[model samples]
Target: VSLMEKLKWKIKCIENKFLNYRLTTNETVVAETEYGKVKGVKRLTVYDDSYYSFEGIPYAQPPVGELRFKAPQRPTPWDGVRDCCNHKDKSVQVDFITGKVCGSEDCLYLSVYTNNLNPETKRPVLVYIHGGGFIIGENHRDMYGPDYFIKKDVVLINIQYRLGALGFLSLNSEDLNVPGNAGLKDQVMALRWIKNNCANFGGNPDNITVFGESAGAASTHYMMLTEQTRGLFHRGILMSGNAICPWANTQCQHRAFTLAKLAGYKGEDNDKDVLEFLMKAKPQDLIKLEEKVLTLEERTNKVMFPFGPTVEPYQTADCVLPKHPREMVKTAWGNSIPTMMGNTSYEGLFFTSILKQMPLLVKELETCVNFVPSELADAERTAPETLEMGAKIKKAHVTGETPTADNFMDLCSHFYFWFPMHRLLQLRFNHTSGTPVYLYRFDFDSEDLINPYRIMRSGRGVKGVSHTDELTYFFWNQLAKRMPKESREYKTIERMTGIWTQFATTGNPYSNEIEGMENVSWDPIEKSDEVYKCLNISDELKMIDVPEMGKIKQWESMFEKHRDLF
Candidate 1:
């Protein structure tokens, strides 16, 4: 189309945005938000229908300048139509995959795509949180295109938040000087925006579902626990991330102090000193601390990640997260909130493959039982409990006594994904009584090689569908363009998308058979003869006994006996 035609088209689009006016309205592309009016772009879909695209909409005040290391404040209202036609830059990040540092401090933004502007339409909304281990990634639609969900008649909202030390650093104070979980609070604020303003974009605020992968899923899971999320969202879809993962939260405050020291701050570990230093530190310097933490985590068997959610000091009104996740799960996982959570069969293969690249790392962890992050890393190996549990796990999963790529991956998978996930469901059952918890094992064999597992393989043997492989099917995979639509991969993609959207719309994920699918009916994880069955998702989906009962029991017993160790 010509430039003039495009401009004329946008004008018509604005006209449509103002079609059904109500409640003292304003411009068409410039919809009046909870705060103020913002101008967005009008674009057409492949189906030749039009949808409004509002990118770079601020959900909170910029966390920069004096606002550094503080809970996100509400975005101040604007006078005129604020331009939201393009995406803003991502948050400050030290890309662990590439060792690159880039982004901006002014990164608290969200993007919304909707085909419907009718307030009466009130379509279900899906708010997505991207995952980069809480250190990297953003809400860019290039990786998460709207066409997939937009075609299903849903509004897709993606968001960006502060990352790395700038986002999660804490002095572990109780005086509100250094409240932790600011990054998580940013998410809650964005959800608050959705609750207040989704109706303006033809979304049903009451039926909103928050969904994400990896750390994003972890964030989604956390949303269910807090009182702040009571009416903000109705359902959650956690794809391969939960509060159960050890890597999801920090156990010690030493990493935060260590991060500060690495960034050239020589302050005492007091609240004011730490906060002042973080506020004055450079964005690049804060991003660089992620690298230092990774170096420490590698030697510590990937125990504590550099940056993630942390426990807030008690006796604070702004405690976004107050207790350890294990203790918090005992309370209502929210009686009304129904969640769908699962992991790829080889969730840990991605990380284990990375370890294999370092000959020393591979050799160091080969026979170590304290593979999970531990305070007494070397000392824990001598414990009778650790030695006994280690031998049990090794005997069940490993091949002979040699720790090759396969056994290392087995250790990683058992510790990282399956055990905690299975245990979490049991806790959910115990906590909520009858609250619905749907579980699945993503066994989709991926041919896509550009995924994290393939990159981490670094010449290691073929891996099971790596972590985030299921994500490729749910959203747009760049490989989708090159891969044949007639293939089984495309068939699985159709079913998975339908299943997810169906879940978001209603409580049931398998209410109907997807077209081109072989008719897979998913069963919820309810007690059947006192044992919960997990749905295994592959091309041939089936309901089966949980895969590794012995491993699950081993960890359950380990945690029961030594709850403090983790």
Candidate 2:
């Protein structure tokens, strides 16, 4: 049968089964949300015998036309059934390869999954933000489906926000009124929708946890800082993305605006006119111009689209200026919120691999530095001591006279992933003293999947648990069909899901049932410089000192030495 026929058959089978089982199809119920009443679909998951879902609910108005590029406004109320069963159109974004169109501006929508439709349950909510490096990805990514979380007995909401130039572009002083970070505004609007209306759909607004990976994780970090996002979420989970790092800072916003001027919107002096023209331009025309102005390599290297969040000098007329969570920590601005942050072991492997593949090394590298400055080179230069220390570490790990490909990969991992992430965690822990912080390093490797890539030997190898490889376990549906459905790794999935859900439900991730799990141990990150648990992806879980792996003090000192250069 054709794919569409198969899908239709599945839908029918599901509908029939619900009818036969006398299931509660809250499909027709209208819930009064802050924005308006939205109708949603309620259906069971085929894989897990768990709760149902309300897909494609509009948390805010469609960010299209004049609404484009402006901070998301409150969605006006609707009178009748707003068909939310289907996924809404995605935000205007470029295809990762061709740099062409895949979605549009009318992408401000959200999907919610819950175990109980009864309004009284007051279940905790997990709002998932999809990752695409601020350019790609959508709420529809299979890994983000809510079936797993519903089975775990929590409400899951995955939201879609504006992306790329349309979502992140900023204008000069003249276009200040255009509002930067439209994507972030859409996210805020979604949270507001949840705060005002989640109860009607069986969710406890007070118990919301916002979690995401990659750019999504970065967004979660930004939300913590923004006063506009204050009180919208109580807990945050940042996986593989730390917004405070040089790679994730807003220092590049000015460079991005420079690119916008190159694209001929011309009103560099007039921020408002620049924003209006860019937003009002036809999607296809703008995308074509964007591609012509910035090559795929340039866009990805500098993160031109999903650029870091801007600290607006003044609040938009309607939205309040959100407090920067980091600044707040320094000034004691607000209540401390629990935060969990971590990165994959081979995080830098992916970045380095991409960089290695570039046809023009020095020129591209220089362009990248101009666009996405990395203090790695400067750090190495200013702190010869640190580089010497790194070289020694590399030499020791290699057990040879010269640095091999594998040893060099390890060095890059230290410079890119381990060091930056460690610094970020320290900052976060120091800033949010009132809230407990849990840090981790994902080290699980799938040999069955790893053996094919020789890169693993370099420790960027499949065996060393390279970047995003853990995602296959975290998000189950995207797994290869050849893999066993009931493999040992699935148990790892259960464990991780349990940890995440537990953390979302309560501040702590440990559960009485999981305390005895083979690879499970809940350890708190301490204030002193001693090492916390360093997860090893072996048959057994192991702990190591944070200082020994790559001393945090050494990395901080390096940052201090080269902060100006970066």
Candidate 3:
């Protein structure tokens, strides 16, 4: 089957060559990096615009053998001009969609796309970090193509970092020396490389914007807090994730020990023994242990990203997460970088696909008081106060008074995404170092095949746009490729890319000169505004106060009132 897949991929590559040649120039493009020279090719976008493509450029040394679970190191400089016309392997992970362990451990590369290779251009750079719950995702062009942003004359970069245990497992021991966040350190190395080399590819290193969705957004928020990433990038855009998301960061020594035990390690329950046991295990074995480590309750509650960024027990020279986000934000080195962040209208709809697979899980929601965000709920989940708080939250967010598949999604949105973002915005409001912060809510639902949740839910008539639904407007993925130029989806694609790239160029997302946006005046969130204002992106653009005001306040007040439980 692997051979057949490779054969099919080769056939597609041949077909792509023919199609690309019809719209491409006869020559390949080349750039000279500080480490070496690389040769790439020019490819046309879906709309017939063209850009130079440099895929799979190594930015760090392979974290294999002894380097496993350690901070990333600089790439070994090459002596020859390397061919960079194809993407390299992603970090080893269990592919979420296929439920198969795939990819390689030696995955520390990034891809670059630009309107031109001319050093004189110095266009704003947009670096995108792909999201797959911090476990499964790649920088593959099929899903995260530069087809849209390149048309806006900005350089685009897609990052590939470690995922799952390879990236995030922390023993939290000074002797074992695995202080977690290797995946995030991979991003830091990639950004450092780009800062030094992007100018060769017509990108302005000083004008770079790091943006992402889901776990990638959390990774972006993580970068913004760490001193290791200081001066690496100038702006950040987080779409649907943050450092404080309940699942984003944790004290994960238990997860590491649990995974080691699941791997059949008979050790003295010491970090040294566990580290040695894991070091000898096969990479595929480590990658496959993700699901096995989940507790029964976590599985039922749909907690998939078990291994993620963790607050290091001890700071190393290259610490990406030395402190938890709550403490780090107080003195963040990146506090002054202009920021843009938001979530979808109904992010919980994305998880309905999982809820449908487990009917028992949906039934469990009937006793909804048993579940509240662990960030807000008591660890002693059966405690009376915890149940009381969960009931209060459910009443406000979930419709129909009782929890079921039909009404439980809104609470899931709050549990996983919305409420955490609300807290992050409040933190920014308190911690801003005199920089503007822009917020948005994505409410647009396409009339056609543009929503990933619609595809995942098999068109179950779910209301509102889902978590990753906004990705369709920002990127040209395989699920959404060609569309009629006159279609609303296409127009939406134009508007999104315009807004994002405009933010990349200047911290402001709205300018009078931006086409189709001359009438929309987006005001940045002010410290004085009791209800934070944000741009509501939809069929029509408008600036409005953040939605779900009453429910957000209910969660906020509950958290404050239950501060002792937390």
Candidate 4:
């Protein structure tokens, strides 16, 4: 059948299912899911006239005590009503808000929000993964609410996966059975559960969309590479994070191993034994050991944490590490699902600012350089030849004057965010034929908040678009209060929300109208050699060449030459 016809058929089937469930008089409902029957709460929200929220539903048995460090097992069914109103225990994460270490291994729950509770209608599903650099944040992070998308007529699933060491520690090959990346595995289990039971929650089992920001986006990218996640989602929306390059080095793994050893595990060669020991240790004792190994103050800015995904043999067991996300796209094993991905304009500024606070810039750079596999860092650092090219491009930013720290910041914008993201998109687009790729650059600046010492605004600057600042537009939260009603920023939010909703519905982000606003032209990234649309919050949509965007192309090309390093 034609693709359009197939989509229509799927929609019809879901509608029919909804109709069948509507015939019943049941207000509260329970679904006999793959693991067991899960009771969901019926409620109403501003967007979905009527919906049910199943908060803190376990996708796997709690990974606490002996279950820790092992592959998530099926959650046992409960006999009595389990109060799911509150969010579950978050995986060990640095609480961004309170600046406290909060989370537990017993955190394998997911939240489901749907417009209708009936088994019929089977609404399209959008599963969101929250972002906090993989070390902080949880599903309860405020900006990830489903109200906006639910109002747009899509079922929303916001999940909280394991984070930190509890979620991503790998000991050795034998532990491979239990392995690390327990957090990512938790996500897979949630998807599996959805496939079997989403129909009962008024969501289409076949039409799932996985979307996330920052580290969550990185997880989404890694998920695209895994064999277990194929066919779980028809499309994806990746914002502000791309794992196209080796962001963490192997030295980071060594440091992690060192910390794990200090914490208790004596077997250095056998990762399985270390993981097993660590998992069985008392929760409070583990936390205290982790604190002793790496103090909270030290972790504030440095990217290295004791727990995170490592470069395991499994990821590249059959071949060399992928040169680009495109390499993954070209392989049969990779997920070539249609994608909507992009980043905030000033993504680098955030990291750069963090680095600047350190007493020694060169030391910090060296630490980052040595943290990863030398091969990965070789790909990321600036080479003499590429540095020359970068210098030439940097000169252009100074146009009429010599470059200063401000100019360097502008140069680094290309060196960091813009170039990396562009290279990633190019690689993916060049390798894939079936899946359409859409790219965007959020250029909206929020000057309302600023840091005086750095003379920069929140994210990276007062003038440039900062990382994650654009999220408020897509996610309804207190952050929206900063944008004035009837202002261009407000209009941009409407346009963006419409595009996101349209993409969730059809995999193509085109809309005739947004509220009373007219349809805006949003071209696909696949159409041109350098395809990207810049959303400046100016209320005007403009297509731009992504590769030729300022000094980014030059800096990126320099970085590309060392592809083997990263």
Candidate 5:
């Protein structure tokens, strides 16, 4: 199998090289943006339809030198047509596969793929934000090819943003301020650029849908919350993350000070001193301390990411996160925008290594009550009822003293991924200005397309769809294009992307444009329903009232009981 995989990759690389040669050599297309003219390439999709790809189009000036931890600035206009046929470097991050610090601070660029480039073609635009816990990810086509999305006659876009400490280091000093969330600000800059210039790529600025999975999803929701992003996007599709997710927003000023000390700072841990130290520090020095800054409790916490969006300590004209997310969600400016949000069945299966040590994990849950979300834990930690709430949470999920993978994964999925979305669902349902809030649960178990989690766990006997499992169907992943067009997996790819683009086009997934979905009316979540309504995507598409009412209630009551803590 390994040899076959290696052989396939070799062939794919050869094909890609041939395609790249053709794309680079041929002066096929040019897009005129506000900044300057850009040369793009015409590429064939999976179905052999030709589309224009404009990669590495800068929307912001490179956030380098003194601008390292500051908000992204407007891109400087070029004198002539800029070449955009190749992808740019991703955001600065410590590569997970190889612990070396790779990428650059000058990495705020967006890619555009479209079947039509006529200024009159008014296609709905779909902008994707890649996800890696706000620490690492890329907008490259290797994993997120536009083949599937471009086939649907919509404009597909992917963007790169600052990551790790360079993107989210917060210092709470007014004088020497680095008021975090530079990453979110980078995304906002990208969106503003797209909004102003998408029409040049045959996109309708008024019909833009910003979507993402995991951290990207959280970023999309963050875009919706801020007043700065008003009129930038018309819809949102949050696949598996949201602003309400505990890890999405945090207070990391101490982590900044910790990172400063880790980078050889000997001065007092004042904001001025820390900012000074970090501003002069090497990019690698700031990037490598991502995981080291996490406390022991946070390290074991199933889904707490170290560096991410934070509530700005000092408000500025450009503050993306002025208040906590929970507060922001209520008064979100994009409440009128149509939204689609959901998660996989076993989203927590990404943590196979940690779940294998269920004994240690359960003990931590019992003692430290680390299972309680970070937002709630901060205030409720010293409260006498906190431990009792944690105990109840554990008991509600695991009836047995010794928990198994089945129940433990369920618990982790709810606490880490599902419940937070459910919380967002309730919040949106309450505050939405009569706009539809569509939700779905991806339960497809494709036999041909192996789950990415299984590959991550070295083909362990893992079951149920995992965190990134839905990505295969939406993207032409490394091997997904190899699946026969007649296979169920290919059909699923069509199904997922069809629904997504349909949503982008019409603000309704079950619209007339979507084929084979005529019979199923995917009703959006309603205030009348006791449990959340969702469309379950498996071998068969079906509407489910979501029978996990008990579990949902358990989490809801737990959060509600400690609501004041937030």
Candidate 6:
């Protein structure tokens, strides 16, 4: 079927959602915004607390036709109260989990969950950006849930933006109007909307915090560096991702130009012409865009996605990514914003099945990718520095001189996930000017016997938790249906949500909230030698040290030997 036809079919499934849910017959809960008034629905929190849910609130106009490749424009004021009851269509892309092609071009919207509607009251706001590597994810309720966060007495704002080629693919020239990073620019537009109108929903515009996971986390980290986001957010929460991640930035205009070619446009010679060609094509025709993804064997320890956030060529001041992410980390823009960044324990465990498919590749997984990610640009992808760094990792982790299925994902997790996390943490921890940066390791997981490839990619009888196991705590999504809550998961949810809201409340993870973690002092990675100290959270919370980090230092030592890698 054609992409447009498939998109129409997806819309049916979305509209069919309201059939299961009906608007309250009694009264319409409405709130006034700077742009217009929106009618919302009342929700019962996990604690059975009362909260207001304003779904599908547009933050910007749809990026269609002339606006397709361009940056987001402010939303036009509607004449009357817009019904925001049923969830809106997600961004234009396929759902990562269900392999479903759903959403719309008019997808730049944000959802709000708050307890207060009084204009005089203001609560802290947590703006969450959904992440599927800038590809297939949406800010709809299915992806993020306020089942726990809303009860924390904090307002929740879930944002939607363009995805995949429509979001990350960009040009290296000016006047083409597609300088790229529109997905991220859409986020900035969301932040601006919150900054101006969050108060209408009883949100403290000045006390907003931006938090996300994976690509969403990288986007949150980039928010700290974006020129337009200087004072838009007071804090950032980076979960399992960073902008400096080697895979986050597109290497060049190669994929963008190739995608244009696939759509029957031949303008590879000039980037501006390439963007212009894709601009002319119908968005639906191009919405089914696919990239040549690298296989597990081919990827080895490298990232698979070809499109992600990239450093844009210097353009007008409105550019979202003018400076490289590494350089941006050194900037003075976010010296005061307290950041919370961390990753899952076994982030690479879910991908182990692919490695187990080809036992030979399991050995390849031993060659841990070690290097400052931003340094491994175009030419550095195949640099000798990589081989030497891998050898050091192999030598350190090898028990009896072999990479077993047991320790392979462990090495992979440290290389691609935790190492980059520590690097970014160091940048913030070392900076006396920057706010306190608290690190963490999510030790929460379901029972070990069964692996339900549900919320996260968890393999059967694997070493550690899967990639997104923590989502069970933050979001009340379908995954929770498959991985039902037990006594163990429930306590973790209460404690985890408590820690999260504590940080969002006052930039510290410790507060008199959850009975267990109320007095536990979660220290920031402050001391120069304490960069590896992270809050180890599970049923019992405590601070623990990362033992494998010593090998990371060794990898950096080898990188220093091959100076000028970038």
Measured by lDDT, the strongest candidate is 3
Off by over 4 Å in 5: 1-27, 300-303, 356-359, 365-368, 375-384, 450-461, 512-515, 559-566
Spell out the clash pairs found in candidate 6. Answer: none
| lDDT (Cα, tens digit) per residue for candidate 1, span 58-120 | 999999888787789998887888888777988998643455587899999999987666646
User: What TM-score does candidate 3 reach?
Assistant: 0.92
Q: Whole-model Cα lDDT per candidate?
A: 0.70, 0.59, 0.80, 0.58, 0.79, 0.71
**How much is 523 displaced in model 2, in angstroms?**
2.4
RMSD of 6: 4.4
lDDT of 2 by residue, 251-323 (tens): 3345444445655666554455555556656865665555455545444444343344555545565342233
Candidate 4's residue-wise lDDT over 1-566, tens digit each?
Answer: 13553454456446534542452234566665655666666654333245566778888888877767555778887675666654576777554333346677677888887666654466778888877655556665233555456555677887877766666655545424544566667777887887777776777888888888777787777667666777777888888766653342122334445556766667654555555666666654555455456544334333445665554434422222223344454563433777887776566555445445643443322222222222333344455553354345545444444434454455445543455567666666555665777767776665552211122222433455666667666665422233555777556667777777778778886566664334345556663654366433334555455533755554444445575422
- Model 3, span 5-33: residue lDDT tens: 44544565566556555645656877899
lDDT digits (tens) for residues 204-258 of candidate 5: 9889999999999999999999999998899999988998887787788788888
Query: What are the per-model numbers of colliding residue pairs?
Result: 1, 18, 0, 19, 0, 0
Q: Lowest-scoring 10 consecutive residues by lDDT in candidate 5?
A: 451-460
lDDT tens string, model 6, 1-566? 23653465466446434522542234459889888889988865434556688888988888888888678888889879999876788877865444546677888888988766774557888989877778777765645767667667788899988887777776766667667788889988888888998888878888889999888888888888777889998888988888877667765456777677777885446887777787787665565665443334325436567566777765764578887786677774765788888888778776666664667756564455532243442333456666666667677556756668766766667666776776666665545474688888887776532212332242444456767777767876533332335566767777787878778878887765575665466777765674377887877777778655775675456556655442
Which clashing pairs does model 1 show? 303-373
Tell me which of candidates 3 and 4 scores higher on lDDT: 3
Model 3, residue pairs in steric clash:
none
TM per candidate: 0.87, 0.79, 0.92, 0.77, 0.92, 0.88
